[PDB]
Design a protein around this ligand. Structure first.
Ligand SMILES: COc1cc2c(cc1OC(C)C)[C@H](c1ccc(Cl)cc1)N(c1ccc(N(C)C[C@H]3CC[C@H](N4CCN(C)C(=O)C4)CC3)cc1)C(=O)C2
Ligand SMILES: [Cl-]
Length: 93
């Protein structure tokens, strides 16, 4: 399980991630990983990108999120994978 310290990491989103974050209310130059995770969470929730019957699976093949992550789908239970996909879309300060 990922160290709690990682969510305190200061990050600067790349342009596509920044675009997505701004669509869920982001106003900042710099975020914590915790903030990024929560904004992306709200994006998934608001748009209902998760399967109605298999609710842990996020489907994003027809969404900007899929461009960002380079996958058609992923499980929210894949925590290391989620960190990796997010980190590839930002610059650690
Ligand atoms: C601070 O750390 C974290 C914050 C957050 C997450 C992970 C974190 O850390 C880990 C990486 C270690 C993840 C998340 C997942 C991926 C990314 Cl790309 C981004 C965020 N998340 C989140 C997002 C979606 C879902 N989904 C999609 C499943 C439910 C199942 C239950 C379902 N239902 C069942 C029926 N009813 C009646 C309900 O009320 C709820 C709703 C969907 C669950 C959690 C967040 O919100 C914020
Ligand atoms: Cl989209």
């Amino acid at each position: 399980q990922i160290p709690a310290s990682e969510q305190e990491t200061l990050v600067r989103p790349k342009p596509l991630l920044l675009k997505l974050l701004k669509s869920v209310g982001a106003q900042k130059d710099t975020y914590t990983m915790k903030e990024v995770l929560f904004y992306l969470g709200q994006y998934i929730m608001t748009k209902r990108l998760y399967d109605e019957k298999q609710q842990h699976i996020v489907y994003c093949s027809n969404d900007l999120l899929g461009d960002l992550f380079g996958v058609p789908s992923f499980s929210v239970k894949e925590h290391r994978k989620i960190y990796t996909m997010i980190y590839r879309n930002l610059v650690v300060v």
